[PDB]
């Protein structure tokens, strides 16, 4: 299946498999706290995780994987995917992070939670980068799919890399239609995949922060989100 899709069929499948944009609880009457803001982020994440599971299975090649392999890839990349989505939604809102259509936070609001500003600035910086590169939607769904398959591939695998190569062919196909030269095609491809390194960095930082908020007992985490957090085992 996955190995037989054209570049256009690959794009169509990924675009169709896109998860919806959920809303935050967030009563604007309620003043912000460290527990309140962390509560909004974890409540949103827990509801987003469910859709991420159904998104992943509709990503070409992912259904062909072992159930244990599926669990592994999602456990290591769930925050990466959550963050690259956050960065993508916030792309047209400079200086602001669109966690939800009704939850729009800037740098200063991130200071309500300790150690959050550093993560906010990184997320904002990545969003500016996407804006500077004029990241297309077709490219976003590819990068997000790449993260899902690549983040835990080293921690069967022949098939995974075969799909990863397929998505690469897709990204190249997209850029060629955009009118880019062979040099411009490889260049942009490199620029996009190097962003995933930063996304990885923000994830590992976000993990330690989330684990920090867990031990500080400022916010009750859902049992699913708790399992996602224990999958990394930090401190």
């Amino acid at each position: 299946l996955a190995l037989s899709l054209t570049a256009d069929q690959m794009v169509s499948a990924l675009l169709d498999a896109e998860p919806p944009i959920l809303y935050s609880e967030y009563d604007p009457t309620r003043p912000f706290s460290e527990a309140s803001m962390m509560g909004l982020l974890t409540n949103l994440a827990d509801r987003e995780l469910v859709h991420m599971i159904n998104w992943a299975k509709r990503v070409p090649g992912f259904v062909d994987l072992t159930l244990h392999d599926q669990v592994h890839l999602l456990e290591c990349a769930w925050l990466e995917i959550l963050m690259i989505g956050l960065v993508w939604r916030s792309m047209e809102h400079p200086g602001k992070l669109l966690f939800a259509p009704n939850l729009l936070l800037d740098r200063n609001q991130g200071k309500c939670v300790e150690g959050m500003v550093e993560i906010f600035d990184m997320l904002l910086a990545t969003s500016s980068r996407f804006r500077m590169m004029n990241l297309q939607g077709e490219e976003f769904v590819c990068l997000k799919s790449i993260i899902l398959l690549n983040s835990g591939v080293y921690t069967e695998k022949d098939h995974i890399h075969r799909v990863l190569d397929k998505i690469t062919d897709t990204l190249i196909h997209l850029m060629a239609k955009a009118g880019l030269t062979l040099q411009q095609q490889h260049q942009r491809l490199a620029q996009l995949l190097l962003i995933l390194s930063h996304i990885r960095h923000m994830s590992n930082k976000g993990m330690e922060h989330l684990y920090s908020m867990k031990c500080k007992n400022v916010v009750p985490l859902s049992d699913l989100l708790l399992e996602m957090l224990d999958a990394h085992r930090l401190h």
Partner: peptide, 9 residues
Amino acid sequence: KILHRLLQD
């Protein structure tokens, strides 16, 4: 695991 069940559904 919770992730296990939801992937099964």
